[PDB]
């Protein structure tokens, strides 16, 4: 499995943000004792996106001029990646 | 001790609050998930799905 | 891949590792349990419907008699003992006393493969061959020797199956005693070994003392059939055969039951996070039950014509044996108290079912101990209710406790608790509907080993019909759960 | 409603006494288990130290014993009460269990078509209030003469002549069975006794 | 074991320092270890939350 | 797992491993070595669990067949042998379970029905008519089937 790393939606006119990502899921059954699940939302990562989201929350809620970010289709939402902490 | 200093600093910090308590502008997760499915290509079918489908 | 195939075959045939022999015993036991269950379903379908709906002819009731006899033999000698004693006995006994192997590593493999030889002979004799043995699981002469429906060789093959199973059990018993007596690690005394080892030791002592007598009885049957002697003929002593067989018969019963007590005690220590209440008391009660079981054999022959003094004596001895089991039941009830057993565990609920069903079966069987009252209950459905609400609800549920406790440990995958809940609860409810009515159909006079019954007994068989459908559902659930246990996911998408 | 004999009455009364005892014990344990389970499931009353109590263990071992000697004595007396009426008879009857039919004084009795499984063409007749001796055996294999409503169930074993004492008080027909596997037609080998 | 009062005062001072610098860290580390084990045996792998 | 032969040869008493170049398997009949790999009970499960995988995958035909044989193998072998040797028993069972066989049932009759409460007690029983023929699915009962005469 290899999907996109978690991102942050941000709506401009409304000025409202929120994290998002792809959640894998499967039919429930017995587990495995010798296995702690790896990072599945952010594959092949040390799970820093949580820290980046926590750090960037103050930046985003305070009001960010994200005109330099791509949009999502024809809506008012733009995607901010959580690869590195957001300062702007 | 450094442990005592850190504990006291954290205790004072949480009085101010945490993002889950202080953040005002924040969308519900259902709206975000619906937007994800309605606009972005599925990572399996490589196309845009209307909504959530089991198969 | 020739080398790989031969290596696997050598791994599972030349082995002497107690773990591998234990898993093999467990596999064979589960398979034979399923076969016995299928035959039981055939029997039940014969009983539920009216008018010999399956055999269609009075002359062909020999098929039904063959079904009951093979059901009994399969479920007693190849289901419980291989599982209760063979599987956990081999897998755990060396580990619980801190040692590598059992004493006599080769005799362990010899035991398992003797069991397999017996199963093979039995399966070939009673399926591929015509007109098989149809004399009930207690092969009473002259029915099993001087009859018309029992003339083929496959009957003698079934008797030899009994012989091989006896040999296997004797070897296993000697091995268990020897390993537990000398290989204990330093600092562990004989009476400080955990409860399961002690119960296995006493079970082994039981098997050693009685199996030679069963061998003598079976050799008597074979000699009567083949060389045409008269040990058990109109000028012989069929009662002598009954005495010998039943001298083996009851020790076999306590051999079956005690290891279940040991396993339940061990698992309880593991899941309630507390020690056994009166561990020394339980161990002494186990040995008491073992010893007292050698003096009660003739409570299965109260109508044969025994002397009046002997009837009274055997009723007394049966009550004596009844006492210490009550002590053990109270000890269990107090053990569970004050503990922190898991509130959502199939092991916990199976323990509850085991306790309740064993108490009820013990009471019903204590009614049958009285010689006088055994006049009205011998060879009715009361006896069937008794030994099925003990065997199929106390021994089976103890093995379910062990199964749901040791699957994660052996395989390293947790258990699907909701699935197991459905299985265990439907097994409980279905089985109760099948056997509980039998009790009140025994007090009403219905004899046993009859494919056709009088019209007075319809309600009991209707409730049995209900129970049989629930049993089919439960066993399918169980098998499908196990198949799901070792199978990876089948659905996965993005949410 | 009559009893049909005195031995059956004695057995019934012993059965009722044991039933009362076992029901009392079951009720006591049910109350105890209800308290224990109700405390447990709510995560109350935990004590890992409570794994021994000498007094309680000794008492709970003693109690079943005293309540069991009474049952044993009652059962023994019931047995001997069954067996006393021997020797006070004036009629003898001999019974042979053939392969799927019975023989009384050299008269054969087989199942009939008027009744499904219960009725027989030739019953066995005994007189009311008259003590009789049944000498029972079998020719081919083991059967079991079973009339449990009169308190009679004795195996007919080849080469072994059993001897039971039968007595009737209520006039009518008692239906019984073979109560021992004997072959294909084991389920169709009924017994009919007429007390007149 | 402190015998005279001076040794008692010395032992008390040492114990206060050790409590500030060695014992409370041990307590917090052990508490974190217990909670980490509880989290490890959670999520459907073990019997966490069934009792206790 | 992988053989330990290099260590065994460079070990401390290599003369004990000369037999290992004869017709001899390493795991079963060779002297164990201080540095041997640890062998587990169910190697498939042991290698699959730490990776989060159940040992058998249903998508692979070989694995599906192997697991079927492990769980349902002897059961179906016994069933097939029984059906081959007793074709008439299963034929009769199929007839009865499909309502094709009726012992002596008539048309339009009522039959006793009681669930429990001990033996037949006239104060508790009901009488039932066949819903199949009430609807109309049944008009006559087949007679070509085997009939237990003399019962
Ligand atoms: C016909 C049926 C024969 C018996 C059943 C065979 C099933 C497998 C068939 C198959 O195609 O297997 C390919 C399959 C190939 O393996 P693989 O997946 O490629 O992996 C390679 C290695 O095996 C590496 O994998 P591994 O070492 O990890 O093993 C995988 C693991 C996978 O296993 C599991 O995951 C589950 C195993 C459960 C074992 C029991 C545990 C305790 C109970 C738990 C509850 C389950 C109960 C059972 C199921 C019912 C549930 C309701 O274990 C096994 O597969 C074997 C475990 C032991 C069970 C089978 C024993 C067979 C030999 C003994 C025969 C006598 C007894 C049976 C009656 C005959 O074979 C095996 O895995 C088994 C090894 C070979 C066994 C045969 C050895 C020779 C036996 C000779 C005597 C035969 C009987 C007498 C005949 C006399 C003349 C008529
Ligand atoms: C341990 C022994 C054992 C077990 C398990 C059973 C299980 C069952 N038995 Fe039977 N039975 C006997 C021992 C046993 N029996 C004996 C000795 C006789 C006398 C033979 C004779 O009279 O000569 C007898 C006779 C007997 C009769 C006699 C009919 C007649 O005499 O008139 C009937 C019919 O109702 C019957 C029914 C059943 C049913 C419906 C089940 C089961 O369907 C109910 C419980 C089912 C279970 C589900 C158990 C199956 C096990 C597996 C599922 C393995 C899975 C793994 C584990 C859980 C460990 N049994
Ligand atoms: C499977 C295990 C098992 C166990 C544990 C037992 C336990 C007992 N059994 Fe039985 N039995 C069988 C398996 C078992 N049995 C089988 C398979 C048959 C049929 C063989 C066949 O015919 O084919 C059989 C048949 C059988 C008969 C045959 C009746 C007849 O055929 O004529 C009799 C009668 O004496 C009997 C008696 C007992 C007694 C008195 C106990 C006692 O051990 C029970 C003791 C239990 C307790 C007493 C519970 C504890 C009670 C309390 C909590 C306190 C109450 C105590 C007092 C008031 C004293 N059993
Ligand atoms: C229904 C009744 C059934 C029959 C019941 C009657 C008994 C049936 C047979 C039971 C056998 C019980 C054996 C008990 C132990 C015997 C001693 C033993 O194992 O010693 C250790 C060993 C076996 O254990 P081992 O090989 O693992 O040894 C471990 C390693 N040492 C030696 C260091 C301890 O025995 C021997 O070395 C010799 C045993 C030979 C046994 C068979 C030889 C003859 C086979 C039959 C020939 C043809 C007959 C016709
Ligand atoms: C207040 C309501 C009482 C309970 C309602 C159900 C029972 C109706 C009245 C009982 C007395 C008359 C007997 C007739 C019916 C008995 C049914 C029965 O189980 O008999 C067995 C047994 C047969 O024993 P019995 O009925 O002979 O009891 C002895 C009766 N005397 C006093 C006359 C000797 O019945 C009982 O034990 C009676 C109580 C039954 C209550 C069952 C509750 C638990 C349900 C478990 C699942 C059962 C599934 C059934 C589903 C049916 C509908 C979908
Ligand atoms: C401990 C192991 C031994 C246990 C012995 C227990 C003895 C109980 C009472 C024995 C007895 O007499 O039981 C009655 C029974 C049948 O009595 P019945 O034949 O009717 O009366 C005499 C008729 N002329 O009598 C019999 O059936 C005869 C029994 C004889 C004793 C056999 C004991 C077993 C011997 C082999 C194993 C020994 C070691 C274990
Ligand atoms: Cu017994
Ligand atoms: Cu008969
Ligand atoms: Cu008969
Ligand atoms: Mg009998």
Q: What is the DSSP string of E9-20?
A: HHHHHHHHHHII
> Half-sphere exposure of F145 toward its Cβ, with a 13 Å CA cutoff?
27
D117 and D187 Cβ atoms separated by less than 8 Å? yes
- Which tokens sit at D130? 């008259």
Cα C467 from chain centroid? 21
Cα C144 from chain centroid? 23
Residues in chain C with CB shorter than 8 Å from the CB of A3 are 494
Beta-carbon contacts of A22 under 8 Å, excluding residues fewer than 6 positions away, are A3, A4, A6, A41, B36, B43, C494
Q: Whose CA is nearest to atom 24 of ligand 6?
A: C307
Tally Cβ neighbours within 10 Å of residue C450.
22
Interface residue C344 vs chain F (CB under 8 A): no
The count of residues in chain B is: 55
Tally Cβ neighbours within 10 Å of residue C343.
16
Breaks (C-N over 2.5 A) in chain F follow: none
C380: buried, middle or exposed (CB in 10 Å: 19+, 13-18, 0-12)? buried
Beta carbons of C493 and B43 less than 8 Å apart: no
Ligand 5, pocket-test mutation among C430, C437, C442, C462, most atoms within 8 A of CB: C437
Question: Residue C1 has what DSSP assignment?
Answer: -
CA–CA separation, A85 and A53 (whole Å): 7
Residues tagged in the binding site annotation of C for Cu(2+): 250, 299-300
Going by C-alpha positions, the residue among C461, C475, C449, C479 that lies closest to residue C61 is C449
Beta carbons of C340 and E52 less than 8 Å apart: yes
D133 and D93 Cβ atoms separated by less than 8 Å? yes
Going by C-alpha positions, the residue among D73, D72, F150 that lies closest to residue C51 is F150
Chains E and A touch (3+ CB pairs under 8 A): yes
SS3 D120: strand
Beta carbons of A32 and E43 less than 8 Å apart: no
Residues in chain A with CB shorter than 8 Å from the CB of B19 are 54, 57-58, 61
CA–CA separation, C78 and C115 (whole Å): 8
C-alpha of residue C91 to centroid of ligand 3, in Å: 30
* E43 backbone φψ class: left, alpha, beta (φ>0; ψ -120 to 50): left
- Which tokens sit at C171? 């070897």
Residues in chain B with CB shorter than 8 Å from the CB of C491 are 54-55
CA–CA separation, D111 and D188 (whole Å): 7
Measure Cα distances from E24 to A55, B35, C156, C330, E20 in Å: 30, 49, 78, 46, 6
Beta carbons of E47 and C345 less than 8 Å apart: yes
For tokens 């009722």, name the residue. D16
Q: By what method was this entry solved?
A: cryo-EM
CA–CA separation, A72 and A80 (whole Å): 11
Q: Say yes or no: CB of residue F117 within 6 Å of ligand 5.
A: yes
Going by C-alpha positions, the residue among A85, A19, A77 that lies closest to residue A51 is A85
Q: Which member of C49, C410, C487 has the closest CB to residue F58?
A: C487
Which residues is C493 bridged to in the sheet?
Answer: A25
SS3 A35: coil
B31 and B40 Cβ atoms separated by less than 8 Å? no
> Half-sphere exposure of C245 toward its Cβ, with a 13 Å CA cutoff?
20
Q: Which atom of ligand 4 is least distant from the CA of C103?
A: 29
F103 and C53 Cβ atoms separated by less than 8 Å? yes
Residue D47 known to bind ligand: no
Q: Which of F41, F49, F77, F88 to mutate: most C Cβ within 10 Å? A: F41
C289: buried, middle or exposed (CB in 10 Å: 19+, 13-18, 0-12)? buried
Which residues is F110 bridged to in the sheet?
Answer: F129
Resolution of the structure in the document, Å: 3.1
Which residues is D133 bridged to in the sheet?
Answer: D92, D165
Residues with CB under 6 A from ligand 3: C 138, 253, 256-257, 299-300, 302, 318, 321-323, 325-326, 329, 359, 362-363, 365-366, 368-369, 374, 378, 383, 386-387, 390-391; D 25, 64, 67-68
Q: Dihedral of CA C468/C473/C474/C480: which sign?
A: positive
Residues in chain B with CB shorter than 8 Å from the CB of E24 are 1, 3-4
Rg of chain B taking only CA atoms, in angstroms? 21
Which residues is A71 bridged to in the sheet?
Answer: A78
Closest ligand, as measured to the CA of F43: 1
Which residues is D143 bridged to in the sheet?
Answer: D156
Residue D155 known to bind ligand: yes
For tokens 């009476």, name the residue. C191
CA–CA separation, D191 and D124 (whole Å): 8
Measure Cα distances from C102 to C77, C89, C176, C187, D38 in Å: 23, 10, 7, 19, 44
The count of residues in chain F is: 151
For tokens 């099925």, name the residue. C388
For the range D10-15, what are the long-range contacts, defined as Cβ-Cβ under 8 Å and sequence gap of 24 or more?
A: D10/C372, D10/D78, D10/D81, D10/D82, D11/C372, D11/C373, D11/C375, D11/C376, D11/D78, D11/D82, D11/D151, D14/C370, D14/C372, D14/C373, D14/D74, D14/D75, D14/D78, D15/C367, D15/C373
Distance from CA of A54 to the nearest CA of C (A): 23
Can you state the angle between helices C105-123 and C18-48, rounded to 10 degrees?
A: 20
Can you state the angle between helices C153-182 and C105-123, rounded to 10 degrees?
A: 160
Beta-carbon contacts of C382 under 8 Å, excluding residues fewer than 6 positions away, are C364, C368, C438, C439, C441, C442, C443
C-alpha of residue F127 to centroid of ligand 1, in Å: 53
- Which tokens sit at C148? 């018309």
Q: B25: nearest CA in chain A?
A: A16
Tally Cβ neighbours within 10 Å of residue C362.
18
Phi, psi of B29 (to 5 degrees): -75, -25
For the range F38-47, what are the long-range contacts, defined as Cβ-Cβ under 8 Å and sequence gap of 24 or more?
A: F39/F1, F41/C19, F41/C20, F41/C23, F41/C410, F42/C410, F42/C411, F45/C411, F45/C412, F45/C413, F45/C486, F46/C412
Closest ligand, as measured to the CA of D155: 10
SS3 F87: helix
C251 and C291 Cβ atoms separated by less than 8 Å? no
CA–CA separation, D132 and D111 (whole Å): 25
Q: D14: nearest CA in chain C?
A: C373
- Which tokens sit at B46? 């490589």
A5 and A49 Cβ atoms separated by less than 8 Å? yes
Interface residue D187 vs chain C (CB under 8 A): yes
**Quick one: chain A helix, strand, coil %, rounded to 5?**
15, 25, 60
Cis upstream peptide for E30 (omega within 30°): no
* C274 backbone φψ class: left, alpha, beta (φ>0; ψ -120 to 50): beta
Which residues is A18 bridged to in the sheet?
Answer: A9
CA–CA separation, C302 and B44 (whole Å): 74
Cα C449 from chain centroid? 19
Measure Cα distances from C205 to C82, C174, C198, C324, E12 in Å: 17, 8, 11, 18, 64
Element (H, E) at D117: none
Beta-carbon contacts of D189 under 8 Å, excluding residues fewer than 6 positions away, are D100, D101, D102, D111, D143, D177, D178, D182
Going by C-alpha positions, the residue among C88, C39, C99 that lies closest to residue C64 is C39
Can you state the angle between helices C61-74 and C153-182, rounded to 10 degrees?
A: 10
Beta-carbon contacts of A39 under 8 Å, excluding residues fewer than 6 positions away, are A45, A46, A47
> Half-sphere exposure of C332 toward its Cβ, with a 13 Å CA cutoff?
27
Beta carbons of A18 and B19 less than 8 Å apart: no
């Amino acid at each position: 499995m290899n999907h996109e790393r978690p991102w942050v939606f941000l709506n401009k006119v409304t000025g409202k943000w929120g994290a998002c990502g792809w959640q894998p899921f499967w039919k429930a059954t017995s587990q495995s004792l010798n296995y702690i699940p790896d990072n599945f939302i952010a594959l092949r990562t040390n799970g820093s996106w949580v820290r980046n989201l926590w750090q960037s929350s103050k930046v985003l809620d305070r009001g960010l001029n994200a005109s330099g970010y791509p949009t999502v289709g024809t809506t008012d939402w733009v995607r901010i990646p959580l690869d590195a902490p957001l300062e702007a | 001790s450094p442990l005592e200093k850190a504990i006291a600093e954290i205790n004072e910090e949480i009085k101010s609050g945490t993002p889950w308590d202080t953040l005002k502008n924040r969308a519900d997760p259902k709206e975000l998930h619906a937007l994800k499915f309605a606009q972005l290509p599925h990572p399996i079918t490589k196309k845009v799905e209307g909504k959530f489908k089991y198969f | 891949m020739i080398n790989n195939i031969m290596h696997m075959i050598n791994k599972y045939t030349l082995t002497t590792s107690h773990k591998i022999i234990g898993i093999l015993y467990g596999y064979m036991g589960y398979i034979a349990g399923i076969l016995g269950y299928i035959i039981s379903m055939l029997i039940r379908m014969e009983l539920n419907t009216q008018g010999l709906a399956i055999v269609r002819k009075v002359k062909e009731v020999t098929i039904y008699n063959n079904w009951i006899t093979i059901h009994g033999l399969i479920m007693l000698f190849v289901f419980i003992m291989p599982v209760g004693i063979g599987f956990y006995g081999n897998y755990l006994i060396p580990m619980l006393i801190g040692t590598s192997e059992l004493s006599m590593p080769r005799m362990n493999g010899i035991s398992f493969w003797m069991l397999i030889v017996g199963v093979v002979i039995f399966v070939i004799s009673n399926v591929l061959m015509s007109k098989p043995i149809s004399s009930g699981w207690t092969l009473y002469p002259p029915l099993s020797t001087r009859d018309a429906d029992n003339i083929g060789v496959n009957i003698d093959l079934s008797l030899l199956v009994v012989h091989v199973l006896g040999i296997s059990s004797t070897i296993g018993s000697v091995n268990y005693i020897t390993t537990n007596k000398y290989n204990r690690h330093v600092g562990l005394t004989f009476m400080n070994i955990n409860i399961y080892n002690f119960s296995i030791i006493v079970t082994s002592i039981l098997l050693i003392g009685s199996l030679p007598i069963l061998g003598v009885a079976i050799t008597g049957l074979l000699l009567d059939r083949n060389i045409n002697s008269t040990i058990y003929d109109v000028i012989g002593d069929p009662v002598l055969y009954q005495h010998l067989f039943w001298f083996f018969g009851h020790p076999e019963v306590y051999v079956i039951i005690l290891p279940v007590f040991g396993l339940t005690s061990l698992i309880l220590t593991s899941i309630i996070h507390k020690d056994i209440f009166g561990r020394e008391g339980m161990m002494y009660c186990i040995i008491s039950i073992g010893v007292v079981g050698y003096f009660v054999w003739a409570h299965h022959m109260f109508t044969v014509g025994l002397d009046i003094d002997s009837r009274s004596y055997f009723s007394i001895a049966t009550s004596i044996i009844s006492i210490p089991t009550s002590v053990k039941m109270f000890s269990y009830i107090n053990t569970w108290a004050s503990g922190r057993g898991f509130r959502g565990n199939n092991s916990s609920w199976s323990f509850f079912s085991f306790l309740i069903c064993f108490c009820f079966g013990g009471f019903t069987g204590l009614l049958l101990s009285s010689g006088s009252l055994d006049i009205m209950l011998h060879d009715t459905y009361f006896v069937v209710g008794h030994f099925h609400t003990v065997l199929s609800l106390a021994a089976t549920f103890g093995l379910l406790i062990a199964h749901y406790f040791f699957l994660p440990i052996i395989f390293s995958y947790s258990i699907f608790e909701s699935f197991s809940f459905y299985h265990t609860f439907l097994l409980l409810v279905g089985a109760l509907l099948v056997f509980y009515p039998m009790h009140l159909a025994g007090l009403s006079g219905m004899a046993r080993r009859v494919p056709e019954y009088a019209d007075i007994f319809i309600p009991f068989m209707t409730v049995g019909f209900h129970g049989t459908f629930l049993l089919i559902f439960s066993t399918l659930t169980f098998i499908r759960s196990y198949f799901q246990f070792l199978s990876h996911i089948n659905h996965s998408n993005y949410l | 409603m009559r009893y049909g004999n005195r031995e059956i009455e004695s057995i019934i009364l012993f059965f009722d006494q044991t039933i009362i005892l076992y029901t009392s014990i079951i009720n006591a344990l049910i109350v105890g288990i209800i308290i224990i389970i109700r405390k447990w499931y709510n995560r109350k009353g935990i004590c890992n130290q409570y794994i021994y109590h000498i007094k309680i263990e000794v008492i709970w071992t003693i109690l079943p014993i005293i309540f069991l000697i009474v049952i044993v004595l009652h059962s023994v007396t019931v047995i001997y009460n069954l067996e006393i009426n021997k020797g006070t008879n004036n009629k003898y009857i001999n019974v042979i269990g053939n392969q799927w039919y019975w023989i009384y004084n050299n008269i054969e009795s087989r199942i009939s078509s008027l009744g499904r499984i219960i009725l027989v063409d030739q019953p066995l007749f005994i007189k009311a209030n008259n003590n009789t001796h049944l000498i029972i055996s079998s020719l081919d294999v083991i059967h079991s003469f079973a009339l449990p409503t009169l308190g009679i169930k004795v195996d007919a074993i080849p080469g072994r002549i059993n001897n039971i004492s039968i007595n009737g008080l209520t006039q009518g027909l008692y239906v019984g069975y073979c109560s021992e596997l004997c072959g294909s037609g084991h389920a169709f080998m009924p017994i009919n006794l007429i007390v007149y | 074991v402190a015998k005279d009062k001076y040794q008692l005062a010395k032992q008390m001072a040492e114990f206060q320092y050790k409590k500030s610098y060695f014992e409370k860290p041990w307590g917090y580390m052990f508490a974190y270890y217990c909670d980490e084990d509880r989290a490890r045996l959670c999520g459907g792998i073990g019997y966490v939350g069934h009792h206790g | 797992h992988g053989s330990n032969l290099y260590n065994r040869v460079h070990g401390n008493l290599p003369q004990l491993y000369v037999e290992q170049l004869y017709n001899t398997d390493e795991i079963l009949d060779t002297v164990p070595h201080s540095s041997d790999p640890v062998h587990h009970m169910f190697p498939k499960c042991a290698a699959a669990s730490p990776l989060g995988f159940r040992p058998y995958d249903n998508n692979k035909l070989w694995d599906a067949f192997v697991l079927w044989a492990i769980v349902y193998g002897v059961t179906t072998i016994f069933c097939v042998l029984h059906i081959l040797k007793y074709p008439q028993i299963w034929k009769h069972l199929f007839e009865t379970l499909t309502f094709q066989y009726t012992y002596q049932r008539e048309i339009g009759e009522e039959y006793v029905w009681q669930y429990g409460g001990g033996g037949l007690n006239p104060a508790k029983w009901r009488f039932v008519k066949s819903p199949l023929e009430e609807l109309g699915l049944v008009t006559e009962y087949r007679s070509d089937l085997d009939y237990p005469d003399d019962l």
